[PDB]
Amino acid sequence: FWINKDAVPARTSLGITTVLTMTTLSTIARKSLPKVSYVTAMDLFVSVCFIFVFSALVEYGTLHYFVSNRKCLDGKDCASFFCCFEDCHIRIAKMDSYARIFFPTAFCLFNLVYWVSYLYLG
C-alpha cells in the first residue's frame, strides 16, 4: 500500500507472491497432522491470513482499474434519517490512503478475538 500507484508490476508481484506464500504455508502447516476431514485452529488462522492478503490484492486491482481504465418521522427527511445517498467518483483515489490503517487494525482485532477465544475458553 505504500508503493506508488504506477508501479504496477511491483505491486502485482507482491500480491501474487503473498498468496503463493499463503498456499505453501497452508500445505506445510497441514502436513503435520493425519488426514482428518475437519478444520483446526491453524487452518482457520491460515484461512484468515489468506483472506487478508487476497483482500489487499483485489484492493490494488480495483484501484488500478478505477484509476487507469475509467474516469412518520420526527427527523425532518425520512431518507436522510434512516438511509443515506449523497453520491455515496468521490474518494476512490484515496483508497490506498486509509487502507494503510484499515487492514492492520482489522488484523489486530482478529488476533485479539482469536487468541482470547482459544487460550482461555479452550
Binding site: 505504500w2 508503493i3 506508488n4 500507484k5 508501479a7
Partner: peptide, 9 residues
Amino acid sequence: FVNYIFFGR
C-alpha cells in the same frame, strides 16, 4: 519507504 516519500506522496 524511500519509494513512498521520494516517488509518491
